[PDB]
Amino acid sequence: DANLLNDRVLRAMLKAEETCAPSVSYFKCVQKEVLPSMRKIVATWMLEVCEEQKCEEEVFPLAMNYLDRFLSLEPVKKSRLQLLGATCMFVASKMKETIPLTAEKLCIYTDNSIRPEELLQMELLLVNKLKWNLAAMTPHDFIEHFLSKMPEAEENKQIIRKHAQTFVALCATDVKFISNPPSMVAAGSVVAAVQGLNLRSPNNFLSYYRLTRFLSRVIKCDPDCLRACQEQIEALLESSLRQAQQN
Amino acid sequence: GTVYKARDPHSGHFVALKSVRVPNGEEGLPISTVREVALLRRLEAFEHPNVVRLMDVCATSEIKVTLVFEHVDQDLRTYLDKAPPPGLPAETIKDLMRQFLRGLDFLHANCIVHRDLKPENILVTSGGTVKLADFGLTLWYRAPEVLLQSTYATPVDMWSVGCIFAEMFRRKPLFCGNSEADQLGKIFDLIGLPPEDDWPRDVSLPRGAFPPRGPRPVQSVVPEMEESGAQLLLEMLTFNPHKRISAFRALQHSYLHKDE
Amino acid sequence: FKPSACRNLFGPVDHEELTRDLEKHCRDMEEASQRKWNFDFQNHKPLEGKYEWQEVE
Ligand SMILES: [Mg+2]
Ligand SMILES: [Mg+2]
Known part of the structure; x- marks a missing residue:
């Protein structure tokens, strides 16, 4: 039954x-510039964004999974950690929401630190680096x-x-x-x-x-x-x- | 584009390349593209022996997505046409059916409805392994509820399985129709006209579209099949999709229990 | 205009360097895949190597 x-x-x-x-060891072994304190800062911001926009509840944890996985494979500069976090939210939203977050709105949420063309190019990098294991x-x-x-x-x-x-x-x-x-x-x-x-x-x-x-x-x-x-x-x-x- | 094929020298196995040319817009990768490709990646992790393995996802950027799949040269229609003149032995058919059902049960357990099961997209390796082929991306094999344009879920695949099951014994399809109305008429010729309270609501053709008809004995269409396999065939060829046997249940039917 | 959640986290971005890097990374993965299968995915036509590609009508 x-x-x-x-x-x-x-x-x-x-x-x-x-x-x-x-990987539990990516701070020690892959990242040079990104410290655990910066993970908490970008994750805190991602969570506020997901809550402000009333995302489905899975978007934020799913985005953190993408972020931790990308960081277990690739060094990321401090100045591009936010871009990775916005891109993770972008892809997670597409996986979990009927009408995903828009590229323009995610850029507004970085105070226009990143630009839409950069979000789309980072999306191809992120998705390909994960070999499309998005589910x-x-x-x-x-x-x-x-x-x-x-x-x-x-x-x-x-x-x-x-x-x-x-x-x-x-x-x-x-x-x-x-x-x-x-x-x-x-x-x-x-x-x-x-x-x-x-x-x-x-x-x-x-x-x-x-x-x-x-x-x-x-x-x-x-x-x-x-x-x-x-x-x-x-x-x-x-x-x-x-x-x-x-x- | 054009589909390519190549042999693996690490083994002797074959590989193929499909490729879709996806619409790139201001919101980047389309929703359906990331979800559908990711679903194939998730399936691949289980390494199920009765589905074609996905080997790679090679995207190039408008944006173009190329999938590398395991390739099986021979489909089931060819496997059946090469069968000995007397036909395939019963044990061979039960073996193909077990694998077919395990593969389908795997897709269903992952909330995939195949929707177009036919001998043309069921593959058989030279070693006898059955592999389901073009999922997650002719009316003969179509479940009644689909021909009626009502609600459909995974049971529509088990109807198709019954058709293919009977076809392995006949070496010619079970219901061959020209339209939905015709395909249905041929179905009710065998399983009988369903009663009134078994008819779906908001359906394309009423029940009065069909003359009254009772069930013929199901072994009239597969006289070479043992009696219990005929019972199992009937449970697949069941009009009500909620009473139709599931793939997992069919695997527990005694007819498909391998001896020793 | 600007919600409080709208904020730059870790300072200025060098955008031209970022664009250069993002395409280097991406083209690198494309090259590696093209070398893995000896198949030019960008133009969809085969190359020569382990895999002898053929069409199947
Ligand atoms: Mg778009
Ligand atoms: Mg298939």
């Missing part, structure tokens, strides 16, 4: 996410699969989904998004999300215990490692709230 195919689909998704993975698995793919297995009210799945997408965006702004595969970012995001930001005593129909073990079983990890992931995500939240409020 749908159970036999859901097993197969999930097993297929876990194999697909190995093919579109960046990468996103954490959002795994979140929807996990949620289709959770016996919760739709009301509650909606909140869980919102929180988990917020958490996925947070991870994508940090070097965690580089080492951890999408399934693991998704699982940690979901178990963090069912904690509801510590606002209420969680009241879930599938216990947190049963969920974490279910999730660990299907993404093939130790439950200890899923809890370490969630803890990293909650530390990322704590840090970003402190950084945000101070200015």
Whole structure:
């Protein structure tokens, strides 16, 4: 039934996410000018752009995947990191949105630092450098699969989904998004999300215990490692709230 | 442009070059181009043995996209015309059908509907491996719901599979029609006229377009096929697309269970 | 006019150098592919090497 195919689909998704993975070592080993601090700056800007333009929620993580992959293969100058980020948003939007972001609007969002002709030429460079492996698995793919297995009210799945997408965006702004595969970012995001930001005593129909073990079983990890992931995500939240409020 | 072919000296296998000349505009690569080529790249990662392998995507810049594919010289129509005068042995047919179904199940599991399955685009290597060919880019093999212009999804491929399945025994197609109305008439000649509450809504031709007709025994059109293979044929040649057997289910049918 | 998300991140771009570089990178990949298959993809006609190309009507 749908159970036999859901097993197969999930097993297929876990194999697909190995093919579109960046290198955890590209700062040390490929980049000379681009530092981790600059990754966070360009990713923070990409995220604001995607949120301003009300992009589908996958555009921003998918663009970070393109960015980390291009940086695992090619040195990029500091002065062209923004151009790479705009191009990654450009291509991710085409993959995920009915009416993609326009070239002219992306250039406006760099304060006209880059020009449309440069965006189009960078798009050919990016797409060819990735050998057209553009259909990468996103954490959002795994979140929807996990949620289709959770016996919760739709009301509650909606909140869980919102929180988990917020958490996925947070991870994508940090070097965690580089080492951890999408399934693991998704699982940690979901178990963090069912904690509801510590606002209420969680009241879930599938216990947190049963969920974490279910999730660990299907993404093939130790439950200890899923809890370490969630803890990293909650530390990322704590840090970003402190950084945000101070200015 | 013109399609080229070449042998690989790393092995002895063949390779071909297709190429599309894509419309370059002010928004760069077209949406359909990046999505469709990326879908082929994603499939390629699974390395499925029953689809032609994509070897490269060579784009040159207006913008031109050239794909390098695995090439299989012989299609199934040729494989069937070379068959011994008595026909292909039953075991050979079950083997071709298993591979055909695994390849199709692979595309369906990736939300690809082939839509134009015919013996001409099912390839057979000199080693006997079946490979599906021109996906993701004559009315004889067309599912009733497509001939009726209603909603269609992956079941339309399983209807085509039933036609080809029966064709491997007959060495001549099952339903040969001149138009949609004619193709349908020949179909109902065999499987019977579907009842009223089985007819789609907002369809091109009403049910009154067709005279009343009952099902003929399905082994009248494949008398050389064993009885359980005939049961399986009927489950593919099922009018309601929601009751039609899926590729994965057909692989669990006892008729296709290899012995030992 | 300019949303706050509109900002240059890391300073001026040298645009002529950027254009030069972007076409060098791209032509380099085209050359490598043409050498990989000994096939001139730009003009769609074959070259000579491992692969003896032929048309198939
Ligand atoms: Mg265009
Ligand atoms: Mg095909």
